[PDB]
């Protein structure tokens, strides 16, 4: 065995393939389930396939339709606007198929590829060059197989974080929310993270009759780590779409109600009744059931310590993915995988660039972002220029949704022109931000944007539309031209 | 007078402003109308504002809603799918307002800006340093004003081309189609140009009862000049949306019918009855009513001869826009304007880069494109690599619209890796192609794409998803790896 991969997810699969396909090595892959769903949720394919980016983007598309059927009327589409309702059981059916279809696929991929073996079970390190597979999570379960090898890849990804608080066992995570029989009727998503904000919008689209969605977050504004303009705007726009966002509130305990309701008590002492309570306040690496001490693999701040080339600390042992407790995205786990394998089984070693990484939040409206934010950048850089346009696009001036401001924001190191970050809020911003991600990889300057000839009319042309900064940050304080 | 601008459009306005706003020069601007509509159509704002990109993109959004209300059902949106119909009179109302709002705007812009004067009428060159404004098109009309100046900018843009053929006076152009009282019931758009293809899709969305849209084009396939993959796919997809595309057919004559219908006879001898006949087979510069010979300004191949800096041939006289008979897009006329003025009234001369220009076709599905196509490039370049992905996105596997293939195609000069062209077909392709337009300006190579970390899930990530060419063109012939 040239390599063993624990975790058949975004990261592990990508390297389990490649390494076999391109370097003719043969490898073993371990995951715990096969198909999506209870009781383990994450199957073959990984978190992103079974319970992540894929299943959720379908639902968010499903949800976005609420806005179309409404805004269509502005361009003269008429019908019985009293006979429309969305059936959540449907949206789950189509989802399931898709995931299972991807599930059923990776199944065959193992069937037909030489030098690629998979076994069901819980794989856990046993010694520097050997990995066990028990029957269960417990390290004293039925040993299924015992794989010896020259190389290990740790790729177990993450798992929802549920706070110690009592009544916790009455709250679910995103996982269980993929499988709700009924849709929630009054719901609390807890946290300001994208996961919370995205599900907030889904739930708000499949809202029954007297339905209401409630978001709470302990800090001052949703989506911490994002440019403040996006945070303000999305906040107003979610509000405008009848989502209740409660800032500076957090559950102290969860009490099960008289009927079947749940009654949440916050720190503030505020009490609210809901039908559902979904935690989303973070995800933790799945390092426990791995049992690394049997080999001596260093943990740190929650994630497996690693260097620039995914070399852990024990030679021959390796780690990438959510298990590293860095930025937990699928394409980052994939880039890390393809790099690892090239360096390990190849001629030209390579390291993953963790900078300028484009990302998106599929809220409604969505957000696309790449690079630094006004704050941070104002502190790493003596002089910072900010180019901002914040208007309501034509198409929305009609429609009805006058509140749907499109926000485009380029922030640069004003000393040379280099673009430090771009931030987008508005329809298709996720599609738009991808290109710019390539631009920044090329160390583009603001002039590279404004010299490019626009595509008219788009929302995107706004990125080539700004030549004169809206304001500057000099040595950390905001300044302007007189 | 520092400069006089004939034509208050995309090109002229952009330079009429700037030159005043930034160089404190004062200038005169001439257009013929004020508000959009009959009898001249193009008012203050230009062709793109009054009867172009702006009014039509609103309609195409209006049209696209047909697809949403249908595809929504797949994600479990239900309603009386027998009680829905679109009211075209509405779609016109909202349009009008918008244009007039832009119209009403440019009005004030003249009110409040010092060093910027506008007069109604037909402005026509009279002598090397003086421009007349008659009351009408005819060069023997009531002289309104007589402006002398140091500099002229020719910017009269274009005008629909109606073939000499008889019965022509029973056909309209895109112009009159902005103002149709009723919507057409059976319609012939004539030509394979974007204008034809876009209106084809609009009309097909506002189709009455026994409605049908028919596109005809004399050549082999719609959209000549576009990558063949896009041409094939869009063709199938328009077909699939119940548009009738007749290839190798062209009108010989147009006969007015018994009732009110129109009966078209093609070259082939095929006879078809329609309600509307819209020509769209080209637009010609508006050089006639200008009367340039009074100063000696050279015409060539239909467009006013110009060099790299818009210098015509007579010093002090200048030309940009559709009047140059090159690529007739709004942002190209704007880039040319902003350059002209910098060079003329400034410290640092500049020339417009006419290459790598990103553009879009707002068909349904839409197309976004930048750079060369498989053909051309295969002939300017000894070795050419083509990277192609052509699948049906998840969201459409459900929905119903299984026929909605997303096409992403990178074509490169395989000798160094440089990206020669990118071609997109599928929803939001216009938004996606804008970024890449910046990438190519930066002389990106294919590795700059595939090294960029994707944004998952998007359609756009497909541009970072292809490392291994699908096929090559060596010295002009198609080749592959064994
Ligand atoms: C609700 C939600 C939505 C998300 N949406 C997005 C998005 O839109 N875009 C995006 O980029 N990212 C998204 N993410 C994050 C993304 O899913 C992760 O970054 C990605 O899955 C990381 O891949 P990985 O291979 O490192 O981890 P995983 O794919 O989780 O790999 C670990 C897998 O191996 C299995 N496993 C775990 N422990 C063991 C063990 N001890 N033995 C054997 N097998 C084991 C598990 O079943 C798990 O599936 C989302 C996450 C969540 C929770
Ligand atoms: C239906 C349609 C859709 C289009 N859609 C798009 C699109 O989506 N994207 C895109 O990039 N491009 C589009 N175009 C093309 C785009 O409109 C042109 O490239 C752009 O308008 C060129 O601007 P211009 O200033 O050079 O010409 P214009 O803006 O036409 O400038 C000339 C103006 O001056 C006036 N004028 C003309 N002659 C005289 C005279 N002798 N004296 C005084 N005034 C005069 C006219 O009213 C005219 O409006 C479209 C064109 C059409 C017809
Ligand atoms: C239905 C079929 C299907 C097929 C696949 C893939 N086959 C090969 C895949 C590749 N990688 C990473 C996951 C290990 C494979 C390798 C081939 C190019 C595409 C990616 S993905 C992925 C999901 C699928 N759903
Ligand atoms: C409603 C208001 C309104 C305002 C304008 C513009 N004002 C200034 C404009 C600018 N140019 C080119 C057209 C000459 C102006 C100059 C200011 C920056 C934006 C472009 S555009 C353009 C369209 C408008 N519709």
mmCIF file of C-alpha atoms in Angstrom, chain A residues 48 53-54 57-58 61-62 65-66 68-69 71-72 74-80 83-87 90 94 98 205-206 331 335 353 358 360 362 394-395 397-398 428 430-432 434-435 437-439 442 444 448-449 451-461 464, chain B residues 48 53-54 57-58 61-62 65-66 68-69 71-72 74-80 83-87 90 94 98 205-206 331 335 353 358 360 362 394-395 397-398 428 430-432 434-435 437-439 442 444 448-449 451-461 464:
data_model
loop_
_atom_site.group_PDB
_atom_site.id
_atom_site.type_symbol
_atom_site.label_atom_id
_atom_site.label_comp_id
_atom_site.label_asym_id
_atom_site.label_seq_id
_atom_site.Cartn_x
_atom_site.Cartn_y
_atom_site.Cartn_z
ATOM 1 C CA UNK A 48 -19.702 18.699 0.856
ATOM 2 C CA UNK A 53 -22.217 22.617 -0.612
ATOM 3 C CA UNK A 54 -24.050 20.350 -3.020
ATOM 4 C CA UNK A 57 -27.021 24.899 -3.085
ATOM 5 C CA UNK A 58 -29.958 22.971 -4.527
ATOM 6 C CA UNK A 61 -31.904 27.623 -5.618
ATOM 7 C CA UNK A 62 -35.245 26.149 -4.569
ATOM 8 C CA UNK A 65 -37.610 30.960 -6.588
ATOM 9 C CA UNK A 66 -39.724 32.819 -4.006
ATOM 10 C CA UNK A 68 -38.684 35.246 -8.954
ATOM 11 C CA UNK A 69 -42.399 34.446 -8.754
ATOM 12 C CA UNK A 71 -40.563 39.956 -8.983
ATOM 13 C CA UNK A 72 -41.942 38.469 -12.221
ATOM 14 C CA UNK A 74 -43.267 43.695 -12.187
ATOM 15 C CA UNK A 75 -42.381 42.673 -15.763
ATOM 16 C CA UNK A 76 -46.034 41.864 -16.282
ATOM 17 C CA UNK A 77 -46.340 38.221 -15.262
ATOM 18 C CA UNK A 78 -49.814 37.644 -13.759
ATOM 19 C CA UNK A 79 -51.507 34.687 -12.100
ATOM 20 C CA UNK A 80 -53.541 33.594 -9.094
ATOM 21 C CA UNK A 83 -52.767 29.676 -5.154
ATOM 22 C CA UNK A 84 -49.020 29.366 -4.709
ATOM 23 C CA UNK A 85 -47.158 27.387 -2.048
ATOM 24 C CA UNK A 86 -43.929 25.405 -1.961
ATOM 25 C CA UNK A 87 -43.807 21.771 -0.971
ATOM 26 C CA UNK A 90 -40.460 17.721 -2.855
ATOM 27 C CA UNK A 94 -34.915 15.841 -5.590
ATOM 28 C CA UNK A 98 -28.914 13.896 -6.534
ATOM 29 C CA UNK A 205 -38.892 30.462 1.562
ATOM 30 C CA UNK A 206 -40.634 27.251 2.747
ATOM 31 C CA UNK A 331 -11.899 23.740 -3.137
ATOM 32 C CA UNK A 335 -6.052 22.165 -3.936
ATOM 33 C CA UNK A 353 -1.423 29.069 -1.814
ATOM 34 C CA UNK A 358 -12.442 33.499 -3.608
ATOM 35 C CA UNK A 360 -19.244 32.914 -1.674
ATOM 36 C CA UNK A 362 -25.313 31.723 -0.835
ATOM 37 C CA UNK A 394 -32.506 49.065 -12.932
ATOM 38 C CA UNK A 395 -34.192 45.674 -13.021
ATOM 39 C CA UNK A 397 -36.119 49.622 -9.404
ATOM 40 C CA UNK A 398 -39.107 48.028 -11.169
ATOM 41 C CA UNK A 428 -24.969 36.254 -9.287
ATOM 42 C CA UNK A 430 -20.909 34.249 -6.573
ATOM 43 C CA UNK A 431 -20.560 33.744 -10.340
ATOM 44 C CA UNK A 432 -18.967 37.142 -10.730
ATOM 45 C CA UNK A 434 -14.779 33.750 -9.515
ATOM 46 C CA UNK A 435 -13.121 35.582 -12.340
ATOM 47 C CA UNK A 437 -10.206 35.427 -8.051
ATOM 48 C CA UNK A 438 -8.072 34.658 -11.116
ATOM 49 C CA UNK A 439 -7.291 38.390 -11.506
ATOM 50 C CA UNK A 442 -2.291 37.543 -11.236
ATOM 51 C CA UNK A 444 -3.885 42.717 -10.716
ATOM 52 C CA UNK A 448 -6.056 46.490 -14.677
ATOM 53 C CA UNK A 449 -9.749 46.615 -13.755
ATOM 54 C CA UNK A 451 -8.737 49.618 -18.232
ATOM 55 C CA UNK A 452 -10.719 46.506 -19.033
ATOM 56 C CA UNK A 453 -13.651 47.215 -21.313
ATOM 57 C CA UNK A 454 -16.989 46.507 -19.661
ATOM 58 C CA UNK A 455 -19.699 44.012 -20.682
ATOM 59 C CA UNK A 456 -22.855 46.106 -20.909
ATOM 60 C CA UNK A 457 -25.236 45.733 -19.342
ATOM 61 C CA UNK A 458 -24.194 43.519 -16.454
ATOM 62 C CA UNK A 459 -23.792 43.917 -12.779
ATOM 63 C CA UNK A 460 -20.179 42.862 -13.208
ATOM 64 C CA UNK A 461 -19.215 45.842 -15.311
ATOM 65 C CA UNK A 464 -14.374 48.132 -14.389
ATOM 66 C CA UNK B 48 -27.961 52.133 -26.267
ATOM 67 C CA UNK B 53 -28.724 47.647 -24.501
ATOM 68 C CA UNK B 54 -30.760 49.243 -21.743
ATOM 69 C CA UNK B 57 -31.979 43.966 -21.298
ATOM 70 C CA UNK B 58 -35.092 44.845 -19.307
ATOM 71 C CA UNK B 61 -35.150 39.845 -18.035
ATOM 72 C CA UNK B 62 -38.920 40.085 -18.439
ATOM 73 C CA UNK B 65 -39.150 34.825 -16.185
ATOM 74 C CA UNK B 66 -40.938 32.288 -18.414
ATOM 75 C CA UNK B 68 -38.299 30.499 -13.799
ATOM 76 C CA UNK B 69 -42.043 30.006 -13.323
ATOM 77 C CA UNK B 71 -38.461 25.436 -13.585
ATOM 78 C CA UNK B 72 -39.670 26.473 -10.112
ATOM 79 C CA UNK B 74 -39.157 21.107 -10.073
ATOM 80 C CA UNK B 75 -38.053 22.474 -6.678
ATOM 81 C CA UNK B 76 -41.616 22.031 -5.504
ATOM 82 C CA UNK B 77 -43.295 25.330 -6.344
ATOM 83 C CA UNK B 78 -46.968 24.667 -7.200
ATOM 84 C CA UNK B 79 -49.814 26.837 -8.447
ATOM 85 C CA UNK B 80 -52.587 27.096 -11.017
ATOM 86 C CA UNK B 83 -53.868 30.925 -14.911
ATOM 87 C CA UNK B 84 -50.578 32.456 -15.994
ATOM 88 C CA UNK B 85 -49.980 34.862 -18.878
ATOM 89 C CA UNK B 86 -47.667 37.805 -19.467
ATOM 90 C CA UNK B 87 -48.941 41.239 -20.353
ATOM 91 C CA UNK B 90 -46.865 46.231 -18.960
ATOM 92 C CA UNK B 94 -41.881 49.938 -17.180
ATOM 93 C CA UNK B 98 -36.807 53.804 -17.239
ATOM 94 C CA UNK B 205 -41.927 34.619 -23.967
ATOM 95 C CA UNK B 206 -44.820 37.025 -24.732
ATOM 96 C CA UNK B 331 -18.351 50.113 -23.851
ATOM 97 C CA UNK B 335 -13.323 53.575 -24.038
ATOM 98 C CA UNK B 353 -7.099 48.554 -27.144
ATOM 99 C CA UNK B 358 -15.511 40.752 -23.588
ATOM 100 C CA UNK B 360 -22.345 38.972 -24.287
ATOM 101 C CA UNK B 362 -28.510 38.040 -24.017
ATOM 102 C CA UNK B 394 -27.265 19.667 -11.381
ATOM 103 C CA UNK B 395 -29.945 22.300 -10.896
ATOM 104 C CA UNK B 397 -31.041 17.828 -14.239
ATOM 105 C CA UNK B 398 -34.033 18.384 -11.933
ATOM 106 C CA UNK B 428 -25.201 34.143 -15.896
ATOM 107 C CA UNK B 430 -22.585 37.307 -19.215
ATOM 108 C CA UNK B 431 -21.773 38.014 -15.554
ATOM 109 C CA UNK B 432 -19.094 35.357 -15.550
ATOM 110 C CA UNK B 434 -16.561 39.914 -17.375
ATOM 111 C CA UNK B 435 -13.920 38.828 -14.939
ATOM 112 C CA UNK B 437 -12.020 39.818 -19.665
ATOM 113 C CA UNK B 438 -9.766 41.349 -16.997
ATOM 114 C CA UNK B 439 -7.728 38.106 -16.863
ATOM 115 C CA UNK B 442 -3.426 40.566 -17.976
ATOM 116 C CA UNK B 444 -3.265 35.143 -18.366
ATOM 117 C CA UNK B 448 -3.323 30.984 -14.203
ATOM 118 C CA UNK B 449 -6.862 29.604 -14.470
ATOM 119 C CA UNK B 451 -4.140 27.249 -10.332
ATOM 120 C CA UNK B 452 -6.877 29.543 -9.102
ATOM 121 C CA UNK B 453 -8.956 27.964 -6.368
ATOM 122 C CA UNK B 454 -12.574 27.465 -7.390
ATOM 123 C CA UNK B 455 -15.739 28.941 -5.837
ATOM 124 C CA UNK B 456 -17.923 25.921 -5.126
ATOM 125 C CA UNK B 457 -20.526 25.429 -6.240
ATOM 126 C CA UNK B 458 -20.805 27.776 -9.198
ATOM 127 C CA UNK B 459 -20.941 27.423 -12.897
ATOM 128 C CA UNK B 460 -17.873 29.638 -13.073
ATOM 129 C CA UNK B 461 -15.616 27.216 -11.263
ATOM 130 C CA UNK B 464 -10.529 26.648 -13.084
#
